[PDB]
Design a protein around this ligand. Structure first.
Ligand SMILES: Nc1ncnc2c1ncn2[C@@H]1O[C@@H]2COP(=O)(O)O[C@H]2[C@H]1O
Ligand SMILES: Nc1ncnc2c1ncn2[C@@H]1O[C@@H]2COP(=O)(O)O[C@H]2[C@H]1O
Ligand SMILES: [Au+]
Lengths: 206, 200
C-alpha cells in the first residue's frame, strides 16, 4: 500500500495553508519536500508573456517540491513552478537531508516518488499534445472530461460535478476568460455542461 | 554506480529512424542509451505526429511504465541516429533495483529534468496559434549549426513534414502558413530551401 512512508511521516513538521495561499514560489531555492495530508494544490507556471498558466493539481498522498531534490550537474536547482493551496491544505514538510537518509534506508520511498513523477510526465506530455492539436473549444471540452476523472470530482445523477471557475479553465487552456465563457455557454447548449457558479456539472461522464 | 547495471542488460542496436517503442504497447522493458540519440514523439487521433523531445547517451527511456502494479507506453521512441541500447526487463530491474537507491535516484533525476523541460514546452505552446508556432520554429532553425547565412538573412533546408512535426500540424497546414508568412515578408520558399529575412 503505502506503509513504507510512515518512517518518513514521523519525521515531518505539519503546516496548514488556507485557500489560495502560495506554498512554493517559482524560482526559489529547493531545500524542503512537501507531502499533502489533506487538501489540494494547484501547479502554476508563467507563459512566454508572463501570464499565469495552470499545469495541474495535486491531492492527498502526493509529494511536491521534489524536483529540486535532483540536481542537473550536481548543483542547486530552483523551484520549477508555483504551488498554491487550492482548498485548505494540511501538508507535511520534510528536509531534503532527512529524505535522503530515509530514501537511503528504504528505496520504496524513491519508487513512490518516481511513480508520481512518471504520472506527472505522462499528464504534462499529453497537455503538450492537447495544446498543439486542439483548438480552444476542444481544449475546454477535454479539460472538463479530464477533471471528471481526477480526484475531487463528484458523482452526479446525470454525470460528474467538478468545482471550477471559467477563469481557472481559461488559465488551464490558454485563452481569455471571455472566450472560455463563450465556449462554455456553447457547450452547455450542446448538452455537455452546466455551469453553477463555483461548480460545473459535466454530463455523460459516469 | 556504473558497469553493474549494463552487466545484466542485453545489448541491441537500432539503425536511424527505426521505431524502438510503439506508443500503446505494454511496458515490460527498460532501455538505456549506450550510444546515439532518440526522438520522443506523440500523435493525435488523426495520425499527426509531434516531437516531444530528444534523449541521448546515458539516458534511460521506457521507464514510465516501471512504477505500476499495468501500464502502456506513453510515446513513440524513434532512433534519431544509430543507437546501441541496453535492454533489461522491468522484472529483473525491479529485482536488482530493490535496495540499490543510487540508480533509482538517477532515474528520478532524468525524469525530473524531463518534467521541467516539458512544462516549459507547455508554457511556450500556450496562446500561440499555428502561424506563430511555425514562425518561431523557423527563427529557431535559423540559429542551428546546419543553417547557412544568406545575404538577405538566413537560409535553412527543411521539409513541411519536419516543420509539421516540430509544431504539431499537418504538412498541408505548414504549406498554408508558409504562403502567408511569405505574404508577411518573413520567409521566401524555394522548394526544399527557405530564406528567413531580417533574422538579426
Ligand atoms: N508539470 C508538472 N506537473 C505536476 N507538478 C509539477 C509540474 N512541474 C512542477 N511541478 C511541481 O511544482 C514544484 C515546484 O518546485 P519543485 O521544482 O521543487 O517541485 C515541483 C513539483 O512538485
Ligand atoms: N515528455 C517526455 N520527455 C522525454 N521522454 C519521454 C516523455 N514522455 C515519454 N517519454 C519517453 O517515452 C517512453 C515511452 O514509453 P514509456 O512510457 O515506458 O517511457 C517513456 C519515456 O522514456
Ligand atoms: Au486564445
Amino acid at each position: 500500500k503505502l506503509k513504507h512512508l510512515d518512517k518518513l511521516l514521523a519525521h515531518c513538521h505539519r503546516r496548514r495553508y488556507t485557500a489560495k495561499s502560495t506554498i512554493i514560489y517559482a524560482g526559489d531555492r529547493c531545500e524542503t519536500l512537501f507531502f499533502i495530508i489533506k487538501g489540494s494544490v494547484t501547479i502554476l507556471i508563467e507563459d512566454d508573456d508572463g501570464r499565469e498558466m495552470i499545469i495541474g493539481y495535486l491531492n492527498s498522498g502526493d509529494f511536491f517540491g521534489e524536483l529540486g531534490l535532483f540536481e542537473k550537474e550536481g548543483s542547486e536547482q530552483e523551484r520549477s513552478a508555483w504551488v498554491r493551496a487550492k482548498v485548505e491544505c494540511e501538508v507535511a514538510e520534510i528536509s531534503y537531508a532527512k529524505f535522503r537518509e530515509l530514501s537511503q534506508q528504504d528505496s520504496e520511498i524513491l519508487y513512490t516518488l518516481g511513480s508520481q513523477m512518471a504520472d506527472r510526465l505522462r499528464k504534462t506530455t499529453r497537455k503538450v499534445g492537447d495544446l498543439a492539436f486542439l483548438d480552444v473549444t476542444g481544449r475546454v471540452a477535454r479539460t472538463l472530461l479530464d477533471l471528471c476523472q481526477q480526484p475531487d470530482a463528484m458523482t452526479h445523477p446525470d454525470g460528474m460535478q467538478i468545482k471550477i471557475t471559467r477563469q481557472e479553465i481559461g488559465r488551464i487552456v490558454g485563452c481569455s476568460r471571455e472566450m472560455v465563457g463563450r465556449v462554455l455557454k456553447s457547450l452547455e447548449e450542446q448538452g455537455l455542461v452546466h455551469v453553477k457558479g463555483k461548480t460545473m456539472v459535466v454530463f455523460g461522464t459516469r
